[PDB]
């Protein structure tokens, strides 16, 4: 059971189909179209995980036939925000599929995220954020990696998606092949808008060095490091 | 004598001061402010090279006191375009200084460019183009790396500038520390605007792989590879 929802209102319904693939019936989107899901644990194993963003029944790639997600109330998410609220880091070793209506996908975990052979299916954009979402008056205002020195790690088996990819962390350590339509990596201690515009930056008390080994199979790569002094090694 | 001007109208006056530092009195800018300099050979050694873009006499960093460049006729270049028109590749092993009015700097050499401990002083933007400039009706229209498989190489001693940096080539092989305000690397077989907007791209007949080893000390890095299939290894 890699994914364990929070007990409260923003905990989605989580189950599994024969073979171990996890199925997540994401919570009702708010009026902005954001499904804000909170978790005590968020990990994807080799059998993968399916996030049900469907308004009609149909065939998922990883978990077979599923009904429409009743939680949606006829209103598919524009953004599936997965927020780890505990101190547990995340490990992604398999595919995350959005079943139904294609959406943006975010995993935020300020304790650390590791991706080793992970991928994202039917996402327009997927973002991995070692940091927290920022909310004002119940609305998403952006993200923060301030005062955080934890790591976004990408292992030897890499990361694949047909969509856009954002990698957001105090520091990144990547050792595998990253395949994506576009890759954006933002490092350092920053605050961000909803769309990962950098709004502010702070100088870390100690060096925050990032390391990119391996190939990046993408037509467009951007790397922004705001940690004045700290570098990007390739 | 690393730098040898073309014999014609666009060949600048090239000399040297005691110690071997080369001094280039760039040609009269056109009405767009472009000083279009043509060369049989263009190489910068450890003593460096000073491009005289000065309207008044003064002190250069690398070559001591110089007069204003008489060729300017009171009209400093906005862009110093250095074009190698022969089949000779370029090696840059030292600093290129713009003396006088800060300008944009371009070196175009479709035969190949190698930079090992090179740098750029008093440039707002410096671009290394393994490719040719494109001219229509006497005006600069952009650049081309089409039908070219040659290499932009950066060696163990790296490249330093306080300004923006563009690296434009069919393929790039970098093994050292690149320090710049911003780094833009565009690889593949492309046509470009004057400002390195990609206007067209072609699929190369064979793979054009680029390799980035070493650190990139810059707050903003962009890598665009249009060679569908070919990758970027870090």
GROMACS .gro file of C-alpha atoms in nm:
model
  468
    1UNK     CA    1   0.000   0.000   0.000
    2UNK     CA    2   0.229   0.276  -0.126
    3UNK     CA    3  -0.039   0.545  -0.127
    4UNK     CA    4  -0.218   0.620   0.201
    5UNK     CA    5  -0.468   0.907   0.200
    6UNK     CA    6  -0.508   1.160   0.479
    7UNK     CA    7  -0.810   1.089   0.702
    8UNK     CA    8  -0.973   1.430   0.644
    9UNK     CA    9  -1.182   1.596   0.372
   10UNK     CA   10  -0.900   1.609   0.119
   11UNK     CA   11  -0.810   1.241   0.143
   12UNK     CA   12  -0.908   1.059  -0.177
   13UNK     CA   13  -1.045   0.706  -0.190
   14UNK     CA   14  -0.761   0.464  -0.253
   15UNK     CA   15  -0.789   0.100  -0.349
   16UNK     CA   16  -0.622  -0.159  -0.570
   17UNK     CA   17  -0.702  -0.401  -0.849
   18UNK     CA   18  -0.572  -0.756  -0.875
   19UNK     CA   19  -0.197  -0.742  -0.937
   20UNK     CA   20  -0.133  -0.447  -0.709
   21UNK     CA   21  -0.202  -0.145  -0.934
   22UNK     CA   22  -0.336   0.134  -0.711
   23UNK     CA   23  -0.653   0.320  -0.806
   24UNK     CA   24  -0.710   0.666  -0.663
   25UNK     CA   25  -1.053   0.824  -0.681
   26UNK     CA   26  -0.934   1.183  -0.649
   27UNK     CA   27  -1.136   1.433  -0.443
   28UNK     CA   28  -1.400   1.669  -0.585
   29UNK     CA   29  -1.231   1.955  -0.772
   30UNK     CA   30  -1.284   2.304  -0.632
   31UNK     CA   31  -1.429   2.585  -0.847
   32UNK     CA   32  -1.087   2.649  -1.007
   33UNK     CA   33  -1.084   2.287  -1.121
   34UNK     CA   34  -0.819   2.182  -0.869
   35UNK     CA   35  -0.850   1.841  -0.709
   36UNK     CA   36  -0.648   1.891  -0.392
   37UNK     CA   37  -0.554   1.547  -0.254
   38UNK     CA   38  -0.373   1.504   0.077
   39UNK     CA   39  -0.168   1.197   0.177
   40UNK     CA   40   0.010   1.044   0.472
   41UNK     CA   41   0.210   0.835   0.223
   42UNK     CA   42   0.253   0.869  -0.153
   43UNK     CA   43   0.455   0.606  -0.336
   44UNK     CA   44   0.406   0.443  -0.672
   45UNK     CA   45   0.538   0.094  -0.726
   46UNK     CA   46   0.615  -0.099  -1.040
   47UNK     CA   47   0.245  -0.199  -1.084
   48UNK     CA   48   0.169   0.172  -1.119
   49UNK     CA   49  -0.113   0.398  -1.005
   50UNK     CA   50  -0.429   0.523  -1.180
   51UNK     CA   51  -0.588   0.855  -1.086
   52UNK     CA   52  -0.953   0.848  -1.188
   53UNK     CA   53  -1.040   1.176  -1.365
   54UNK     CA   54  -1.319   1.020  -1.571
   55UNK     CA   55  -1.673   1.144  -1.629
   56UNK     CA   56  -1.768   0.823  -1.813
   57UNK     CA   57  -1.675   0.458  -1.765
   58UNK     CA   58  -1.400   0.313  -1.980
   59UNK     CA   59  -1.071   0.131  -2.013
   60UNK     CA   60  -0.765   0.246  -1.820
   61UNK     CA   61  -0.420   0.145  -1.944
   62UNK     CA   62  -0.297   0.011  -1.609
   63UNK     CA   63  -0.604  -0.102  -1.412
   64UNK     CA   64  -0.860  -0.224  -1.665
   65UNK     CA   65  -1.222  -0.110  -1.676
   66UNK     CA   66  -1.325   0.162  -1.431
   67UNK     CA   67  -1.641   0.358  -1.365
   68UNK     CA   68  -1.652   0.734  -1.373
   69UNK     CA   69  -1.519   0.887  -1.053
   70UNK     CA   70  -1.833   0.963  -0.849
   71UNK     CA   71  -1.640   1.222  -0.648
   72UNK     CA   72  -1.614   1.452  -0.950
   73UNK     CA   73  -1.983   1.538  -0.961
   74UNK     CA   74  -1.958   1.586  -1.341
   75UNK     CA   75  -1.664   1.815  -1.326
   76UNK     CA   76  -1.321   1.678  -1.422
   77UNK     CA   77  -1.009   1.816  -1.260
   78UNK     CA   78  -0.788   2.059  -1.452
   79UNK     CA   79  -0.511   1.999  -1.199
   80UNK     CA   80  -0.460   1.691  -0.985
   81UNK     CA   81  -0.258   1.819  -0.689
   82UNK     CA   82  -0.114   1.540  -0.472
   83UNK     CA   83   0.022   1.682  -0.144
   84UNK     CA   84   0.209   1.473   0.114
   85UNK     CA   85   0.133   1.629   0.452
   86UNK     CA   86   0.343   1.400   0.673
   87UNK     CA   87   0.720   1.372   0.710
   88UNK     CA   88   0.740   1.069   0.480
   89UNK     CA   89   0.937   1.104   0.154
   90UNK     CA   90   0.802   0.969  -0.178
   91UNK     CA   91   0.932   0.699  -0.407
   92UNK     CA   92   0.802   0.664  -0.761
   93UNK     CA   93   0.905   0.337  -0.927
   94UNK     CA   94   0.627   0.305  -1.183
   95UNK     CA   95   0.372   0.480  -1.402
   96UNK     CA   96   0.111   0.731  -1.287
   97UNK     CA   97  -0.186   0.730  -1.524
   98UNK     CA   98  -0.461   0.992  -1.542
   99UNK     CA   99  -0.765   0.789  -1.649
  100UNK     CA  100  -1.028   0.988  -1.834
  101UNK     CA  101  -0.985   1.360  -1.899
  102UNK     CA  102  -0.619   1.463  -1.947
  103UNK     CA  103  -0.506   1.696  -1.668
  104UNK     CA  104  -0.206   1.865  -1.512
  105UNK     CA  105  -0.043   1.656  -1.236
  106UNK     CA  106   0.160   1.773  -0.936
  107UNK     CA  107   0.322   1.576  -0.656
  108UNK     CA  108   0.442   1.793  -0.369
  109UNK     CA  109   0.649   1.641  -0.093
  110UNK     CA  110   0.881   1.864   0.105
  111UNK     CA  111   1.054   1.558   0.256
  112UNK     CA  112   1.197   1.446  -0.076
  113UNK     CA  113   1.091   1.274  -0.398
  114UNK     CA  114   1.278   0.991  -0.572
  115UNK     CA  115   1.185   0.876  -0.926
  116UNK     CA  116   1.341   0.556  -1.063
  117UNK     CA  117   1.170   0.422  -1.373
  118UNK     CA  118   0.865   0.635  -1.310
  119UNK     CA  119   0.643   0.793  -1.575
  120UNK     CA  120   0.327   0.992  -1.638
  121UNK     CA  121   0.047   0.891  -1.874
  122UNK     CA  122  -0.227   1.122  -2.011
  123UNK     CA  123  -0.088   1.429  -1.839
  124UNK     CA  124  -0.047   1.760  -2.023
  125UNK     CA  125   0.209   1.864  -1.762
  126UNK     CA  126   0.364   1.675  -1.466
  127UNK     CA  127   0.548   1.852  -1.187
  128UNK     CA  128   0.752   1.706  -0.904
  129UNK     CA  129   0.790   1.956  -0.622
  130UNK     CA  130   1.015   1.898  -0.319
  131UNK     CA  131   0.832   2.175  -0.138
  132UNK     CA  132   0.483   2.276  -0.028
  133UNK     CA  133   0.184   2.422  -0.199
  134UNK     CA  134   0.080   2.769  -0.080
  135UNK     CA  135  -0.287   2.840  -0.014
  136UNK     CA  136  -0.455   3.173   0.059
  137UNK     CA  137  -0.825   3.182   0.146
  138UNK     CA  138  -0.874   2.827   0.019
  139UNK     CA  139  -0.720   2.902  -0.322
  140UNK     CA  140  -0.389   2.771  -0.458
  141UNK     CA  141  -0.138   3.056  -0.482
  142UNK     CA  142   0.175   2.864  -0.575
  143UNK     CA  143   0.458   2.663  -0.417
  144UNK     CA  144   0.753   2.706  -0.187
  145UNK     CA  145   1.095   2.544  -0.156
  146UNK     CA  146   1.207   2.801   0.102
  147UNK     CA  147   1.404   2.677   0.404
  148UNK     CA  148   1.424   2.331   0.257
  149UNK     CA  149   1.742   2.139   0.167
  150UNK     CA  150   1.589   1.811   0.062
  151UNK     CA  151   1.650   1.629  -0.267
  152UNK     CA  152   1.462   1.546  -0.586
  153UNK     CA  153   1.644   1.231  -0.700
  154UNK     CA  154   1.610   1.063  -1.036
  155UNK     CA  155   1.758   0.716  -1.057
  156UNK     CA  156   1.921   0.503  -1.326
  157UNK     CA  157   1.590   0.392  -1.479
  158UNK     CA  158   1.489   0.748  -1.555
  159UNK     CA  159   1.155   0.919  -1.611
  160UNK     CA  160   0.928   0.919  -1.913
  161UNK     CA  161   0.630   1.125  -2.021
  162UNK     CA  162   0.481   1.253  -2.346
  163UNK     CA  163   0.382   1.576  -2.172
  164UNK     CA  164   0.566   1.872  -2.020
  165UNK     CA  165   0.779   1.808  -1.710
  166UNK     CA  166   0.871   2.037  -1.421
  167UNK     CA  167   1.132   1.940  -1.164
  168UNK     CA  168   1.122   2.175  -0.866
  169UNK     CA  169   1.348   2.126  -0.564
  170UNK     CA  170   1.615   2.280  -0.341
  171UNK     CA  171   1.854   2.049  -0.524
  172UNK     CA  172   1.827   1.783  -0.793
  173UNK     CA  173   2.038   1.468  -0.841
  174UNK     CA  174   1.960   1.287  -1.167
  175UNK     CA  175   2.140   0.976  -1.295
  176UNK     CA  176   1.911   0.846  -1.569
  177UNK     CA  177   1.737   0.926  -1.896
  178UNK     CA  178   1.466   1.190  -1.873
  179UNK     CA  179   1.221   1.182  -2.163
  180UNK     CA  180   0.961   1.461  -2.189
  181UNK     CA  181   0.811   1.712  -2.434
  182UNK     CA  182   0.985   1.991  -2.243
  183UNK     CA  183   1.192   1.982  -1.925
  184UNK     CA  184   1.200   2.267  -1.673
  185UNK     CA  185   1.419   2.234  -1.367
  186UNK     CA  186   1.409   2.506  -1.103
  187UNK     CA  187   1.652   2.470  -0.814
  188UNK     CA  188   1.730   2.667  -0.500
  189UNK     CA  189   1.508   2.807  -0.225
  190UNK     CA  190   1.223   2.988  -0.399
  191UNK     CA  191   0.860   3.081  -0.395
  192UNK     CA  192   0.664   3.011  -0.714
  193UNK     CA  193   0.334   3.107  -0.874
  194UNK     CA  194   0.079   2.841  -0.972
  195UNK     CA  195   0.261   2.816  -1.305
  196UNK     CA  196   0.613   2.804  -1.155
  197UNK     CA  197   0.710   3.162  -1.221
  198UNK     CA  198   0.980   3.240  -0.967
  199UNK     CA  199   0.846   3.509  -0.734
  200UNK     CA  200   1.122   3.526  -0.472
  201UNK     CA  201   1.448   3.352  -0.385
  202UNK     CA  202   1.665   3.321  -0.078
  203UNK     CA  203   2.032   3.242  -0.031
  204UNK     CA  204   2.071   2.905   0.140
  205UNK     CA  205   2.279   2.883   0.458
  206UNK     CA  206   2.485   2.608   0.295
  207UNK     CA  207   2.555   2.515  -0.068
  208UNK     CA  208   2.271   2.356  -0.264
  209UNK     CA  209   2.445   2.177  -0.551
  210UNK     CA  210   2.257   1.996  -0.827
  211UNK     CA  211   2.390   1.713  -1.045
  212UNK     CA  212   2.264   1.606  -1.388
  213UNK     CA  213   2.412   1.283  -1.518
  214UNK     CA  214   2.249   1.095  -1.802
  215UNK     CA  215   2.066   1.195  -2.114
  216UNK     CA  216   1.781   1.438  -2.151
  217UNK     CA  217   1.564   1.339  -2.443
  218UNK     CA  218   1.368   1.656  -2.497
  219UNK     CA  219   1.356   1.931  -2.757
  220UNK     CA  220   1.354   2.201  -2.488
  221UNK     CA  221   1.542   2.203  -2.157
  222UNK     CA  222   1.559   2.488  -1.907
  223UNK     CA  223   1.753   2.490  -1.583
  224UNK     CA  224   1.727   2.781  -1.343
  225UNK     CA  225   1.934   2.780  -1.024
  226UNK     CA  226   1.877   3.073  -0.789
  227UNK     CA  227   2.120   2.957  -0.521
  228UNK     CA  228   2.382   3.226  -0.583
  229UNK     CA  229   2.718   3.050  -0.574
  230UNK     CA  230   2.587   2.695  -0.601
  231UNK     CA  231   2.627   2.537  -0.945
  232UNK     CA  232   2.483   2.291  -1.193
  233UNK     CA  233   2.714   2.001  -1.278
  234UNK     CA  234   2.675   1.807  -1.603
  235UNK     CA  235   4.921   3.582  -3.596
  236UNK     CA  236   4.600   3.401  -3.500
  237UNK     CA  237   4.368   3.652  -3.666
  238UNK     CA  238   4.412   3.718  -4.038
  239UNK     CA  239   4.161   3.952  -4.204
  240UNK     CA  240   4.009   3.899  -4.546
  241UNK     CA  241   4.171   4.116  -4.816
  242UNK     CA  242   3.844   4.284  -4.921
  243UNK     CA  243   3.623   4.567  -4.792
  244UNK     CA  244   3.509   4.378  -4.484
  245UNK     CA  245   3.858   4.290  -4.362
  246UNK     CA  246   3.941   4.486  -4.046
  247UNK     CA  247   4.285   4.625  -3.964
  248UNK     CA  248   4.470   4.378  -3.746
  249UNK     CA  249   4.789   4.440  -3.553
  250UNK     CA  250   4.953   4.354  -3.222
  251UNK     CA  251   5.105   4.522  -2.919
  252UNK     CA  252   5.424   4.411  -2.744
  253UNK     CA  253   5.358   4.074  -2.580
  254UNK     CA  254   5.142   3.937  -2.858
  255UNK     CA  255   4.793   4.070  -2.772
  256UNK     CA  256   4.608   4.124  -3.100
  257UNK     CA  257   4.430   4.452  -3.170
  258UNK     CA  258   4.150   4.456  -3.425
  259UNK     CA  259   4.025   4.785  -3.562
  260UNK     CA  260   3.683   4.658  -3.668
  261UNK     CA  261   3.526   4.781  -3.994
  262UNK     CA  262   3.283   5.074  -4.020
  263UNK     CA  263   2.939   4.968  -3.892
  264UNK     CA  264   2.655   4.970  -4.143
  265UNK     CA  265   2.336   5.172  -4.083
  266UNK     CA  266   2.197   4.897  -3.855
  267UNK     CA  267   2.506   4.935  -3.638
  268UNK     CA  268   2.659   4.605  -3.750
  269UNK     CA  269   3.033   4.589  -3.796
  270UNK     CA  270   3.065   4.296  -4.036
  271UNK     CA  271   3.424   4.168  -4.024
  272UNK     CA  272   3.549   3.892  -4.253
  273UNK     CA  273   3.853   3.671  -4.183
  274UNK     CA  274   4.072   3.410  -4.347
  275UNK     CA  275   4.177   3.302  -3.996
  276UNK     CA  276   4.028   3.379  -3.656
  277UNK     CA  277   4.204   3.249  -3.347
  278UNK     CA  278   4.261   3.404  -3.008
  279UNK     CA  279   4.564   3.300  -2.810
  280UNK     CA  280   4.646   3.328  -2.444
  281UNK     CA  281   4.760   3.694  -2.485
  282UNK     CA  282   4.403   3.772  -2.593
  283UNK     CA  283   4.248   4.002  -2.853
  284UNK     CA  284   4.104   4.354  -2.830
  285UNK     CA  285   3.832   4.472  -3.067
  286UNK     CA  286   3.839   4.850  -3.084
  287UNK     CA  287   3.482   4.984  -3.054
  288UNK     CA  288   3.592   5.316  -2.905
  289UNK     CA  289   3.488   5.669  -2.999
  290UNK     CA  290   3.745   5.821  -2.761
  291UNK     CA  291   4.098   5.722  -2.660
  292UNK     CA  292   4.146   5.531  -2.338
  293UNK     CA  293   4.280   5.231  -2.152
  294UNK     CA  294   4.203   4.878  -2.269
  295UNK     CA  295   4.231   4.592  -2.021
  296UNK     CA  296   4.448   4.371  -2.243
  297UNK     CA  297   4.643   4.601  -2.478
  298UNK     CA  298   4.704   4.926  -2.289
  299UNK     CA  299   4.624   5.271  -2.425
  300UNK     CA  300   4.449   5.288  -2.762
  301UNK     CA  301   4.311   5.565  -2.979
  302UNK     CA  302   3.953   5.574  -3.093
  303UNK     CA  303   3.893   5.344  -3.389
  304UNK     CA  304   3.910   5.576  -3.692
  305UNK     CA  305   3.708   5.327  -3.895
  306UNK     CA  306   3.396   5.394  -3.689
  307UNK     CA  307   3.344   5.747  -3.818
  308UNK     CA  308   3.181   5.842  -3.483
  309UNK     CA  309   2.942   5.556  -3.480
  310UNK     CA  310   3.013   5.262  -3.246
  311UNK     CA  311   2.904   4.914  -3.341
  312UNK     CA  312   2.596   4.761  -3.179
  313UNK     CA  313   2.705   4.419  -3.303
  314UNK     CA  314   3.058   4.307  -3.383
  315UNK     CA  315   3.009   4.021  -3.629
  316UNK     CA  316   3.326   3.819  -3.692
  317UNK     CA  317   3.279   3.585  -3.991
  318UNK     CA  318   3.539   3.329  -4.099
  319UNK     CA  319   3.500   3.293  -4.476
  320UNK     CA  320   3.766   3.027  -4.539
  321UNK     CA  321   3.771   2.658  -4.449
  322UNK     CA  322   3.987   2.715  -4.140
  323UNK     CA  323   3.838   2.630  -3.799
  324UNK     CA  324   3.877   2.865  -3.499
  325UNK     CA  325   4.052   2.817  -3.168
  326UNK     CA  326   3.990   3.053  -2.878
  327UNK     CA  327   4.241   3.012  -2.594
  328UNK     CA  328   4.218   3.357  -2.438
  329UNK     CA  329   4.008   3.665  -2.373
  330UNK     CA  330   3.828   3.874  -2.635
  331UNK     CA  331   3.782   4.230  -2.512
  332UNK     CA  332   3.553   4.493  -2.662
  333UNK     CA  333   3.739   4.818  -2.594
  334UNK     CA  334   3.517   5.123  -2.570
  335UNK     CA  335   3.141   5.097  -2.615
  336UNK     CA  336   2.997   4.764  -2.494
  337UNK     CA  337   2.850   4.566  -2.784
  338UNK     CA  338   2.710   4.230  -2.886
  339UNK     CA  339   2.978   3.991  -3.019
  340UNK     CA  340   2.940   3.702  -3.265
  341UNK     CA  341   3.198   3.464  -3.406
  342UNK     CA  342   3.068   3.256  -3.695
  343UNK     CA  343   3.279   2.975  -3.833
  344UNK     CA  344   3.106   2.689  -4.011
  345UNK     CA  345   3.428   2.481  -3.998
  346UNK     CA  346   3.420   2.451  -3.621
  347UNK     CA  347   3.495   2.656  -3.309
  348UNK     CA  348   3.695   2.537  -3.007
  349UNK     CA  349   3.705   2.738  -2.681
  350UNK     CA  350   3.954   2.637  -2.409
  351UNK     CA  351   4.002   2.899  -2.140
  352UNK     CA  352   3.845   3.166  -2.356
  353UNK     CA  353   3.634   3.458  -2.235
  354UNK     CA  354   3.454   3.776  -2.337
  355UNK     CA  355   3.503   4.117  -2.178
  356UNK     CA  356   3.267   4.417  -2.210
  357UNK     CA  357   3.015   4.226  -2.420
  358UNK     CA  358   2.642   4.241  -2.346
  359UNK     CA  359   2.600   3.915  -2.536
  360UNK     CA  360   2.855   3.677  -2.695
  361UNK     CA  361   2.755   3.412  -2.947
  362UNK     CA  362   2.962   3.131  -3.093
  363UNK     CA  363   2.807   3.003  -3.414
  364UNK     CA  364   2.934   2.695  -3.600
  365UNK     CA  365   2.742   2.808  -3.906
  366UNK     CA  366   2.710   3.103  -4.142
  367UNK     CA  367   2.546   3.439  -4.126
  368UNK     CA  368   2.262   3.495  -4.372
  369UNK     CA  369   2.247   3.822  -4.566
  370UNK     CA  370   1.967   3.954  -4.787
  371UNK     CA  371   2.018   4.278  -4.980
  372UNK     CA  372   2.320   4.369  -4.769
  373UNK     CA  373   2.132   4.329  -4.440
  374UNK     CA  374   2.186   4.059  -4.176
  375UNK     CA  375   1.887   3.826  -4.168
  376UNK     CA  376   2.013   3.560  -3.929
  377UNK     CA  377   2.227   3.244  -3.921
  378UNK     CA  378   2.230   2.891  -4.052
  379UNK     CA  379   2.363   2.559  -3.926
  380UNK     CA  380   2.188   2.369  -4.205
  381UNK     CA  381   2.379   2.088  -4.378
  382UNK     CA  382   2.662   2.119  -4.131
  383UNK     CA  383   2.788   1.849  -3.893
  384UNK     CA  384   3.082   2.031  -3.741
  385UNK     CA  385   3.149   2.080  -3.370
  386UNK     CA  386   3.148   2.360  -3.114
  387UNK     CA  387   3.396   2.227  -2.857
  388UNK     CA  388   3.456   2.368  -2.512
  389UNK     CA  389   3.767   2.238  -2.339
  390UNK     CA  390   3.873   2.171  -1.980
  391UNK     CA  391   3.961   2.535  -1.908
  392UNK     CA  392   3.609   2.650  -1.982
  393UNK     CA  393   3.459   2.982  -2.088
  394UNK     CA  394   3.387   3.292  -1.885
  395UNK     CA  395   3.186   3.607  -1.942
  396UNK     CA  396   2.979   3.849  -1.735
  397UNK     CA  397   2.734   3.884  -2.024
  398UNK     CA  398   2.482   3.658  -2.198
  399UNK     CA  399   2.618   3.359  -2.392
  400UNK     CA  400   2.481   3.178  -2.697
  401UNK     CA  401   2.627   2.850  -2.818
  402UNK     CA  402   2.496   2.763  -3.163
  403UNK     CA  403   2.614   2.453  -3.351
  404UNK     CA  404   2.512   2.128  -3.518
  405UNK     CA  405   2.655   1.962  -3.209
  406UNK     CA  406   2.828   2.075  -2.892
  407UNK     CA  407   3.094   1.894  -2.685
  408UNK     CA  408   3.173   2.073  -2.358
  409UNK     CA  409   3.414   1.947  -2.091
  410UNK     CA  410   3.475   2.252  -1.873
  411UNK     CA  411   3.315   2.519  -1.657
  412UNK     CA  412   3.095   2.766  -1.843
  413UNK     CA  413   3.037   3.090  -1.653
  414UNK     CA  414   2.787   3.341  -1.797
  415UNK     CA  415   2.487   3.558  -1.701
  416UNK     CA  416   2.265   3.329  -1.908
  417UNK     CA  417   2.352   3.032  -2.129
  418UNK     CA  418   2.158   2.941  -2.443
  419UNK     CA  419   2.262   2.638  -2.641
  420UNK     CA  420   2.085   2.560  -2.967
  421UNK     CA  421   2.185   2.239  -3.142
  422UNK     CA  422   2.087   2.064  -3.463
  423UNK     CA  423   2.057   2.186  -3.821
  424UNK     CA  424   1.857   2.509  -3.809
  425UNK     CA  425   1.802   2.851  -3.951
  426UNK     CA  426   1.789   3.138  -3.702
  427UNK     CA  427   1.679   3.500  -3.688
  428UNK     CA  428   1.924   3.777  -3.594
  429UNK     CA  429   1.830   3.709  -3.231
  430UNK     CA  430   1.856   3.328  -3.255
  431UNK     CA  431   1.488   3.253  -3.280
  432UNK     CA  432   1.467   2.915  -3.451
  433UNK     CA  433   1.294   2.965  -3.786
  434UNK     CA  434   1.333   2.621  -3.943
  435UNK     CA  435   1.496   2.286  -3.868
  436UNK     CA  436   1.600   1.983  -4.069
  437UNK     CA  437   1.656   1.621  -3.975
  438UNK     CA  438   2.025   1.536  -4.010
  439UNK     CA  439   2.124   1.238  -4.227
  440UNK     CA  440   2.317   1.098  -3.930
  441UNK     CA  441   2.289   1.146  -3.554
  442UNK     CA  442   2.406   1.480  -3.413
  443UNK     CA  443   2.473   1.407  -3.046
  444UNK     CA  444   2.578   1.676  -2.797
  445UNK     CA  445   2.769   1.621  -2.472
  446UNK     CA  446   2.778   1.850  -2.168
  447UNK     CA  447   3.032   1.755  -1.905
  448UNK     CA  448   3.139   2.002  -1.640
  449UNK     CA  449   2.965   2.273  -1.446
  450UNK     CA  450   2.748   2.551  -1.575
  451UNK     CA  451   2.773   2.851  -1.347
  452UNK     CA  452   2.473   3.050  -1.458
  453UNK     CA  453   2.134   3.139  -1.315
  454UNK     CA  454   1.959   3.053  -1.642
  455UNK     CA  455   2.041   2.771  -1.883
  456UNK     CA  456   1.845   2.672  -2.193
  457UNK     CA  457   1.924   2.385  -2.426
  458UNK     CA  458   1.723   2.331  -2.742
  459UNK     CA  459   1.803   2.033  -2.966
  460UNK     CA  460   1.601   2.010  -3.287
  461UNK     CA  461   1.770   1.697  -3.417
  462UNK     CA  462   1.474   1.464  -3.368
  463UNK     CA  463   1.614   1.144  -3.218
  464UNK     CA  464   1.955   1.282  -3.121
  465UNK     CA  465   1.997   1.354  -2.750
  466UNK     CA  466   2.168   1.573  -2.494
  467UNK     CA  467   2.397   1.383  -2.255
  468UNK     CA  468   2.486   1.526  -1.913
   0.00000   0.00000   0.00000
